[PDB]
Structure 1
Amino acid sequence: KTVVVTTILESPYVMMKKNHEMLEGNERYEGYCVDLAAEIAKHCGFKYKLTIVGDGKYGARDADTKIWNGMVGELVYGKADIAIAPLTITLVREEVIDFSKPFMSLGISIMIKKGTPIESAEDLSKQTEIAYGTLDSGSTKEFFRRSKIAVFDKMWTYMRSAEPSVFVRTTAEGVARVRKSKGKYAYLLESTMNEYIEQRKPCDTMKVGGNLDSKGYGIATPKGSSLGNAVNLAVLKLNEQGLLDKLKNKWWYDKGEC
């Protein structure tokens, strides 16, 4: 009867509080998705325990074994009752679990080190002097790889052919690369992460240009889960009570340095 919530350690969505070793259970964690979890539970009348996804992954099906990892795997294989994380709503996932309507929208955007003479994807496309790239594996890369749009296609062919490599293994590396490259590298990533980092010391980065695309984060439950309907309704209510906006403002701006 205690609901098992699975999530993932990703700031500012879910973080381990500074004195977590002095804290018990759910109080070890803070962040946007921790509050969201609490808000969901209140409007759904259930008790819950926060767990961190065992393998540190989101949810991907291995082409060969067909096994799901991450949070999606924890739902499908019955370790968790529900996922409350920055888990993107995608077709392959929707086919094996239920999604709430998205609690947050986002898109591909450009992170620059402040000073950089770039204001848009187009700016990036027309030049090579400032290197730019994405995570070496994931949707942003595939977006570029698959786009039929001129600008985005010129960016991809550029990125694929660039030497040395413009791809990074981790988000943290991308951001470092920006910060360390003295304004000669730009990074493509979730507008949400871009916005968050903009509010981080040493305050030396900046989101520019519009979003290139659009996707959504949703709460995830097993197909036919008794929780999903209430959970989805709770998402919509929260949005209409200004609460999701308030949460975002909280973790991004009110608690922002810079």
Structure 2
Amino acid sequence: TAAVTTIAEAPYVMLKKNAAAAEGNAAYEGYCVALAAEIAKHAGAAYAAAIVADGKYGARDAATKAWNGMVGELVYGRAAAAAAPLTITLVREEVIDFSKPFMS
């Protein structure tokens, strides 16, 4: 299995009503959850959505080169696929490998 790292709140991924009633990834619904279902059928991954805890997208802190959030949760091996709106930028690119944009 694989663990996905999406951000918590946006127009993209949200908490559906009766969040306590539902369990697992099914408690969560949004655009980038509907997407991260489609990609499964094209790559075969059987996953379980796992939102970043810090709630930041991520940058190497000036004092300490420690990436935060999803781009952090990826580098340190905590979880693989970042099915969420990460802007394709140079600094993230030199550390992590993206895909082609799904939105511009």
Residues 86-105 of structure 1 mapped to structure 2, 5 A cutoff: 86-105=85-104
CA distance in 2, matches of 1:78, 1:62: 19
CA distance in 2, matches of 1:20, 1:56: 19
Residues 10-21 of structure 1 mapped to structure 2, 5 A cutoff: 10-21=9-20
Task: Find the counterpart in structure 2 of residue 58 from structure 1.
Answer: 57
Percent of pairs with identical residues: 76
CA distance in 1, matches of 2:45, 2:102: 19
- Unaligned runs of 5+ residues in structure 1 are 106-258
CA distance in 1, matches of 2:71, 2:96: 8
CA distance in 2, matches of 1:71, 1:79: 10
Question: How much has 1:11 moved relative to structure 2?
Answer: 2.4
CA distance in 1, matches of 2:85, 2:75: 18
CA distance in 1, matches of 2:20, 2:10: 18
CA distance in 2, matches of 1:83, 1:95: 16
Larger Rg: 1
Query: Which protein has greater RCO, CA pairs closer than 8 Å, 6+ apart?
Result: 2
CA distance in 2, matches of 1:28, 1:102: 27
TM-score (norm 1): 0.40
Deviations 1:69-105 (A, max 9, x none): 0101100011111101111010000000110000111
Q: State the secondary structure of the residue aligned to 1:55.
A: coil
Q: State the secondary structure of the residue aligned to 2:34.
A: helix
CA distance in 1, matches of 2:90, 2:47: 28
CA distance in 1, matches of 2:47, 2:54: 21
CA distance in 2, matches of 1:16, 1:101: 27
TM-score (norm 2): 0.96
**Higher normalized helix content (fraction of residues):** 1
| RMSD between superposed Cα atoms in Å | 0.8
2:11 counterpart of 1:9: no
Question: How much has 1:10 moved relative to structure 2?
Answer: 2.5
- Unaligned runs of 5+ residues in structure 2 are none
Question: How much has 1:26 moved relative to structure 2?
Answer: 1.0
Question: How much has 1:22 moved relative to structure 2?
Answer: 0.4
Number of aligned residue pairs: give it: 104
CA distance in 2, matches of 1:92, 1:11: 23
Q: State the secondary structure of the residue aligned to 2:86.
A: coil
Deviations 1:5-47 (A, max 9, x none): 0011232210011111001111011111001110111111110
